[model samples]
Target: DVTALCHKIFLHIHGLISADRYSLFLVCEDSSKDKFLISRLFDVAEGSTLEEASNNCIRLEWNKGIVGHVAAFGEPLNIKDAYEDPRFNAEVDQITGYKTQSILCMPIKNHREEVVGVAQAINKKSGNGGTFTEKDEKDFAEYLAFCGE
Candidate 1:
């Protein structure tokens, strides 16, 4: 299925980036509209899927968390310090029992100029000061462009 393949490709992308965590958040409205359908919801492993999201999902608004903000405005954000950002909801740490230090998140827009999905990578272990760079954001955006085409 496309979703499964998409997850694989995104996970491969995660491998290239220096991030320790990566999850693709999809716009799903099957059961509700205020939750992110996280694919591969784990750090560097295929540990869980929608089954986890069903139990660990958080309420999302367009302007809410980092992912929400990107999904809402179709803007790409490269956050160096995830903990310092207000848009990043730290509650997920409490729910999933994992910590995030950095993030590189962006929107996946369709041909109609609408964001169809979103990608978020956490804790860049690139060993470059433990922060995501603008280059990472640009490279990720280019990858998304290729994926879109």
Candidate 2:
């Protein structure tokens, strides 16, 4: 169920942004009640089955990384060079063996305007520097408006 939901969403997200991969990190609270982000789906791309992409689960601090920053601040970030940003964590790349270049990450909010999750599209497929454009950011934000519902 969760896998299928993310898989279906990734299908449209990849088409919408022309990203090579997509990931979703939902906000969760630990037993201590400290909020964090948990990735159910990581680096999912076209042709990869949902079951195959489900194993790379990871968690992030509430206020760390690009995804954390976006979720914490309820803002969107489009970075051309992930390595240049101090907030960009390289650990994921190390584990997945996939080099991360450009990133388009945004917060997913509910009707109350609360950030519920973070959605990230990695590696723009077409562009000058292979980075996401303003148009991509705009489209991502607009489309994500319906995601939290």
lDDT of each: 0.62, 0.73
The number of the candidate with the highest lDDT is: 2
| Stretches of candidate 2 exceeding 4 Å from the true structure | 1-6, 31-33, 124-131
Write the residue-wise lDDT of candidate 2 on 45-120 in tens digits.
7767877877769677787777777777888876666646877676676776766567776888888877778887
Q: In candidate 2, residue 135 scores what lDDT?
A: 71
Model 1 stretches with alpha carbons more than 4 Å out: 28-59, 124-130, 146-149
Candidate 2 residue pairs that clash = none
TM per candidate:
0.69, 0.81
Model 1 scores worst on lDDT over the 10 consecutive residues at 39-48
Tell how far residue 39 is off in model 2, in angstroms. Answer: 0.3
